[PDB]
A paper describes a structure:
To assess if the introduced amino acid exchanges affected the overall structure and the binding of the oxime, we also crystallized the tyrosine variants in complex with selected oxime substrates. Interestingly, the binding mode of the oxime substrates also did not change in most of the structures. Testing the tyrosine variants for oxime reduction showed that the exchange of the non-canonical tyrosine Y370 to phenylalanine in OPR3 led to significantly decreased product formation compared to the wild type (OPR3_Y370F). In comparison to the wild type, the non-canonical tyrosine variant Y370F of OPR3 showed a 4-fold decrease in both kred and Kd in the reductive half-reaction and a 3- and 2-fold decrease in kox and Kd in the oxidative half-reaction. The effect of the Y370F mutation on the oxidative half-reaction is a clear indication that this residue has a role in the catalytic mechanism.
The biocatalytic reduction of the oxime moiety to the corresponding amine group has only recently been found to be a promiscuous activity of ene-reductases transforming α-oximo β-keto esters. By studying the crystal structures of enzyme oxime complexes, analyzing molecular dynamics simulations, and investigating biocatalytic cascades and possible intermediates, we obtained evidence that the reaction proceeds via an imine intermediate and not via the hydroxylamine intermediate. All the crystal structures obtained had a high resolution (1.9–1.35 Å) and showed clear electron density features for the oximes.
Numbering used by the authors: 9 to 286, 297 to 385
Amino acid sequence: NNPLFSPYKMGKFNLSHRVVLAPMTRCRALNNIPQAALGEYYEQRATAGGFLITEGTMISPTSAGFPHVPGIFTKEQVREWKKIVDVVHAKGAVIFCQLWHVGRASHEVYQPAGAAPISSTEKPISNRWRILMPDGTHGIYPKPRAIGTYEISQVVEDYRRSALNAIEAGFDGIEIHGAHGYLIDQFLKDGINDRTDEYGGSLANRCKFITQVVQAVVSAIGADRVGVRVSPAIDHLDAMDSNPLSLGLAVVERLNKIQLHSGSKLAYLHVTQPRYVASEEEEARLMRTLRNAYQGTFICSGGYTRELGIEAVAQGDADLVSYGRLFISNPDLVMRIKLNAPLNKYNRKTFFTQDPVVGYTDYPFLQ
Ligand SMILES: Cc1cc2nc3c(=O)[nH]c(=O)nc-3n(C[C@H](O)[C@H](O)[C@H](O)COP(=O)(O)O)c2cc1C
Ligand SMILES: CCOC(=O)/C(=N\O)C(C)=O
């Protein structure tokens, strides 16, 4: 029996299997408005009792660092998301919206009035990394503006309002993108956060921002509708920490405490495998250490295959396994994993293009 097809109770959500659509930016949401193409894409991948997480979704006008990514901060966006959620729900799937602020991982071209992007720090991402521009060229990450505590409270409110908007659109819940060197990770990582106020210095202070964000969304929509994604060890956008395992455990402690205070568990903790990029034992150590420390559901992501996903669930390393790239090219990935059917190759060249069909909805199902 395939352990990926054991049912799982993710809080009040009864999942029929443990294969999850990982959140993936695809850049088809023209002008930050969800489009009908997204509805077709998510519908193709939805299964009865399966869990889907959307592409990262803007919480405010300053939260983007990619072209044509959806927002959920306007009523127009909420109206269009509702059409997509309705088609996914008609297939019996559960869907969460990932709330995403990129912080310093942006460019003047993506910011209102060409202003600098915001961060914990004035330190830019280094020139080892370049940003995808709307014309398909690559640009230079600029120096961000370091925000004060009033503005931090405004950003927390943007997460809270976006969570309420997601519920209004019919989403089952939201995921906080606290990973991958984006805004929240720019507060978490000691390689980035050079602040001397209450949001920097100590590990406890560096965890303040994520704690406040999670508390705000939990208060607004309930813990069982909130998932949290982190990546304490990741090679992405110069987001390093001197002690990744202690950073991860400090975040896990905060999430455990939020749950005890709220009297309810979060939907899940979602952790990226350190092997994933845009020793193996230290990486496996870290994943299992975080899972064992967290009082709740654990989703693993990053480089998983059918075999590795089966092993993760069978060995108790994770409750759910999210797949990215293979879900791009296999709309029926769940069925293919169930049948052990051969998988289709994916085309990286069309990961972030704008076409509503090509490289998006035209990967074939099984015959
Ligand atoms: C095209 C693409 C876009 C992605 N965008 C996001 C994103 O918006 N938010 C996020 O948390 N992770 C994002 N990721 C990481 C994925 O959620 C996932 O963790 C990763 O793809 C898993 O590894 P796999 O592709 O080997 O299955 C993205 C990955 C890809 C390939
Ligand atoms: C490498 C880790 O970063 C990611 O996967 C990502 N978003 O989180 C994108 C847009 O690629």
